[PDB]
Design an enzyme around this catalytic site. Structure first.
Site, mmCIF file in Angstrom:
data_model
loop_
_atom_site.group_PDB
_atom_site.id
_atom_site.type_symbol
_atom_site.label_atom_id
_atom_site.label_comp_id
_atom_site.label_asym_id
_atom_site.label_seq_id
_atom_site.Cartn_x
_atom_site.Cartn_y
_atom_site.Cartn_z
ATOM 1 N N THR D 13 0.832 -1.192 0.000
ATOM 2 C CA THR D 13 0.000 0.000 0.000
ATOM 3 C C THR D 13 0.873 1.251 0.000
ATOM 4 O OG1 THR D 13 -1.891 1.052 1.047
ATOM 5 C CG2 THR D 13 -0.223 0.146 2.544
ATOM 6 N N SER D 45 9.664 -1.318 -6.697
ATOM 7 C CA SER D 45 9.895 -0.991 -8.096
ATOM 8 C C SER D 45 11.342 -1.282 -8.501
ATOM 9 C CB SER D 45 9.520 0.441 -8.394
ATOM 10 O OG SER D 45 10.210 1.352 -7.544
ATOM 11 N N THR D 78 8.035 4.407 -7.058
ATOM 12 C CA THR D 78 8.460 5.605 -7.760
ATOM 13 C C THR D 78 9.738 5.354 -8.560
ATOM 14 O OG1 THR D 78 9.388 6.329 -5.659
ATOM 15 C CG2 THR D 78 7.236 7.204 -6.226
ATOM 16 N N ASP D 79 10.664 4.552 -8.014
ATOM 17 C CA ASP D 79 12.005 4.402 -8.572
ATOM 18 C C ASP D 79 11.987 3.963 -10.036
ATOM 19 O OD1 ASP D 79 13.186 4.980 -6.052
ATOM 20 O OD2 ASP D 79 13.575 2.864 -5.620
#
Lengths: 313, 325, 312, 310
Positions: D13, D45, D78-79
């Site tokens: 989450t 990620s 995000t990465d």
């Protein structure tokens, strides 16, 4: 027509080298010959800080005239940097042609060392001549970048790279003698615009009042009394209004002045707020807001229609 | 040991949830606002011994020079005390840069003065204010923060009051200084100082205002196509000591603006040519009337011109203040 | 008396056309009103081919020049591609408070609207000014003064490529005037400990990129060729895949220093004790590598190296 | 009534099975859409892989064919969201909104962005003006195009930016303001269909710097890479060592793609330099396209045209 036909309208002095001036320009930068069949016209000669609604109107008319002809593929207008964004956005809304309209400027004088104007002109001509440039709205070209009139603004007093749309970016870039289009603006403009001003010889008076601590009410009165039809408010934050500014806006609305809340911040959205007077300018900066408010006012003075104009233009 | 931090509040809380589902508010009956704030972020207690104080209660659009004057003087009292290591000041985002730069010039202390603000309402999903305050308190309490000038802390960033500005009307990341960058950033509960401002401020500043109750009227006029002369007239008629020109480009002036400016000059008004562009140097230009604003945007230019005008009417002195502060 | 400025050229000229440095000086003769300049053709290569060994010599030369009392500053013409590397190296190794101003041009000298002439003039003005002292090494281009520790080429092909988004410019040059804005809050030049005047070569340091499906075999290659350090242009904030973690841990076993930086272009890579290697602070890969090379000349102790990366 | 939006989760989450925790933590979403949570994967990620992204593509196409899905929101780290998002950008055969979403702060953190990021992302997926605009990354009040958006900063809420290309739109005051339409091919106009494929070509990325080693090109060759994206010095500039390495690769039929480490801008054609050029695609984006490119062809010219048009 194999090389395209480009009319370079000058509105002021040359931006390259050192006749009318538009001839000095073309002499100084002979390489435009290889990009297009160019014909100069010295539309006017003034510094952009002295450019005026009445003249921009004449320029919108002239440019429409030129783009009606079959022997003109596009127009490059040389303009000062200071108000090019205002001129540009005006012709953005009023030019009834998909043919390219490219404003160009220079941040250094043509005699200065490492003058930007020559290569600015070359990029501008290349953009006007290229057939991928059709239907993109009015464009501003400078420092390898292609801005949309509706988004591009002069962000910096004195730098070559001053023209930027931080949130919206560039329509495209010119690197290695080649154009890369990145975006199409998702707004109405040019042929899809409702604003035609080929009738007019004059435009409504619209003034811009700044927002700041201790901002005076009396500048609202002054503006009312000189008979403005629109006030644009270059407002604090998201068009926030002091007690004094609200008071001035109350009195403007009572006289049927349209009040347009923009932002002094530099970027971003001014959201609707019904607790606050007047309209809001979407993501139009003060200078752009005025241009659209003027043209809005020549077709209506209904708040709701104008508001929707600001969301769609 | 934990440092001592006063939190002056100038408006409503920037931190605090309401009630949805089954949760109940942090907005209790009659609650002060700065208490609402401090109760809503008890993690500050770990960083510092804080003490709330409701200094004022207005939206930053209504903040007035005369109120900022008292705030400066109030902060000076605090920072003179031994039992106070630094000060955090909750302020609306709209004119924080104005208030911040005033105190940047007028606080006679090396002790950290950190403005903090919030672009999202406290009651909003993902409100920034909580973490903004935490960062703000950390920066005021750190020893490395001394002598840096007034700071503005928001969205993990530390902006000098002299450079920082709200560049976007609506976004969380609105406070930037495009050319001057940030003094520092806060990342992973650690402060990373990058720059010291190379201008005069705080304890090396001449703008003492400790016995003032009033400030010179300065107004700001926009530069644009068809910009009216009569607006200069209007300002003159209302007795402004100065005019800041939110100028076209590098403070370029239309025939109408030049007319209005040379009128203002005749009647003893100091004209200060800045830019609406948002960034960069307005350079000297003896062909054009008035003074120039260096890298000071209109909002800042007004503040420095007001404070200069408390000390002098001499353009050459005022110009030098604009190159050094 | 005008200031005396030696101009070191590392490549071809960036102004005018026909030593390249004389062509340079002649082609922008306004510099003579700003300073007394001597030229000197240190090297002649594109910045792409600039090597650690050569940069070491450049540093050593600049120290020779600035040791002399008859030299007030130095301007160094260099290509844009790796000026941030060269400049950061000298930033750390030049034991003078005297101005060292890297300058460069994004357009060839013979291009229309070449930036090189004006860049150079600004560079000399900065080098010649007495307010310029003790600011660390600077990169001067497109009216900007960039700190060597922060400034980077952020764009392939534009004049306005050199930026430091988060930390901004040391100052700007508008209207034949320098406007100084910031002093970098980091150790450099005369407060640096890096003194490489006794050296003739530098430890080998490589940069490996982070990305989806990034292979461990690249770490192996690096190790097998004797690298003393590895900089990791990490995904996000130095994040490492299972393959990256394997290759790092293998590197660390072999006594290679691993420095986790970022490919994002900006920002802090913070400490994470759950992950191997050190963190680059706000040093981008290319800067991180320079500082790791130098740190390795003095220490191989990760604790000491970590402190360098937080204070330089 | 509301539109029907599937939330696919690739990890834990970003608000508050992770994807159920997420929806319960942000109950304001259910007033915007009809949401069906679905836990596609669970990884950081940093560990997301081509074979998994290939499955995510296929899965998303499945959903978008169904008439009871108006659009899809994908939670992602995000990465490498920019890589995942750009893969789907090219391979989803639908005009229905595909919106990646993410958080720079963890869900437990004070002033977490995940809640509003998710809300925005759902609003963007539920809106009907959102159709036909490509894959979108939504975060920090911004809608960026997968093709342009990138993580520009290691650690900041505002990290996602496209300096030169800007944002497709912004979400301010619970309203979407569309600014630009990307002027590139994508989604339904794309030629890249990977619904058949089981695995993908190997493409690795080598950095350009002072003293860059030739031996990494050698290694890449010997480990059988089909393409090498060069995160090059400035505008794809190559050292003498890089050229030799690049030549060896081209001998062996490896497609060399010249990109930039700079983080923005055009790498221009240059017939004097080895390999192709990446246009305005950064290394991460360039690799993705070069992968998909190599599933249809290994003709340089065709791949180069892909790079100018996608």
């Amino acid at each position: 027509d194999k090389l395209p036909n480009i009319v370079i309208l000058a509105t002021g002095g040359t931006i390259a080298g050192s006749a009318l001036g538009v001839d000095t320009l073309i002499n100084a930068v002979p390489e435009v010959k290889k990009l297009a069949n160019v014909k100069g016209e010295q539309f006017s000669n003034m510094a952009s800080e002295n450019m005026t609604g009445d003249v921009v109107l004449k320029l919108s008319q002239r440019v429409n005239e030129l783009l009606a002809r079959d022997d003109v593929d596009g127009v490059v207008i040389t303009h000062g940097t200071d108000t090019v964004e205002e001129s540009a956005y005006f012709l953005h809304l009023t030019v009834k042609s998909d043919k390219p309209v490219v404003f160009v400027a220079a941040m250094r004088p043509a005699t200065a060392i490492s003058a930007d104007g020559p290569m600015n002109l070359l990029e501008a001509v290349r953009v006007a001549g290229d057939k991928q440039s059709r239907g993109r709205g009015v464009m501003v070209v400078i420092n390898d970048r292609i801005g949309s009139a509706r988004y591009i603004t002069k962000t910096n007093a004195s730098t070559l790279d001053t023209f930027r749309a931080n949130e919206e970016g560039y329509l495209g870039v010119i690197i290695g003698n080649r154009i890369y289009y990145q975006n199409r603006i998702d707004k109405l403009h040019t042929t899809r615009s409702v604003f035609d001003v080929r009738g007019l010889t004059s435009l409504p008076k619209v003034d811009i009042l700044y927002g700041y601590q201790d901002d005076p009410e009396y500048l609202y009165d002054a503006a009312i009394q000189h008979g403005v039809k629109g006030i644009v408010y270059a407002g604090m934050g998201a068009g926030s209004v002091s007690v004094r500014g609200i008071a001035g806006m109350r009195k403007a609305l009572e006289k049927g002045v349209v009040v347009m809340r923009s932002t002094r911040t530099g970027n971003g959205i001014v959201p609707p707020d019904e607790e606050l007077p007047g309209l809001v300018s979407d993501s139009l900066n003060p200078a752009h807001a005025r241009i659209l408010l003027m043209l809005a006012l020549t077709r209506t003075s209904d708040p709701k229609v104008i508001q929707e104009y600001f969301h769609t233009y």
